Amino acid sequence: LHKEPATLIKAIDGDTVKLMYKGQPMTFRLLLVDTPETKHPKKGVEKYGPEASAFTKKMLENAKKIEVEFDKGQRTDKYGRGLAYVYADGKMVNEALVRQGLAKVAYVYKPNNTHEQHLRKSEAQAKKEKLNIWS
Template structure:
């Protein structure tokens, strides 16, 4: 009886294995092999697909601009573009993967996950802090969770765009933050000179004389005050 149960159980096991294999295959999303045409920006390229050139906007990420008509060139924009260019130009195979949502944006650009020799470009940009997670829509968010983890790791390391505090924010990149920090740095230096670096002494007549770092006798003066 026990032997019969074992024999009867074999087909059940085979069915389960077949089912698991079938499910795993469903997780493998179709990719389309394309040929690189041109790199526009860190998050935008053009490819040849079905014999025509199509502009592709990377899903779920945003990189600083390099030639925006209003924003101009932003910090780390050139680095992001050059890194994307290096990845796609050196790749033996470039592929696109589409999500379940709209395949084009309002500018008629294709929306896709871009792969170079099996590696997702979005992830590679995030690993180096050259992109932020952005333009998230529920219907096109297949890999949102895993790329957010990468973004947090880069943020924690303070690399790329995360080197400058508050430069990368939820609504975009903020170069004005750098200007504000530069002004603060200059003010701090001025305050240091005005507060701590001024040397004071008293001459033979009892007159109090003050020397700033720009004074000709600053180095020779021994501070009394």
């Protein structure tokens, strides 16, 4: 896989952010993670949704460098969103959310699953520490 630079436009939710990628505005969905969301009526604001959303937002807004990393399979979903691992100063946002108990590892779709075991590892630790969603 390779990392490519991007620039923050707007964080929309815990797991969806708008970035400037190769000069174009694009919505990215973070690969392999489900955060509780603030967006959806059938739901409303679920618990830990505002927390997940502020975390992603702060981590990206305070970064020196943001990079996106596409996996081996398809790179957009049916809504036109890019499917990627997003890094803030070299730290994967998708993992950071899971490690903090602010996201679950999603239902995985091969072949987009390179960092799957890494993420499950972090999720088991957050579970062991009874953090946030696991509290």
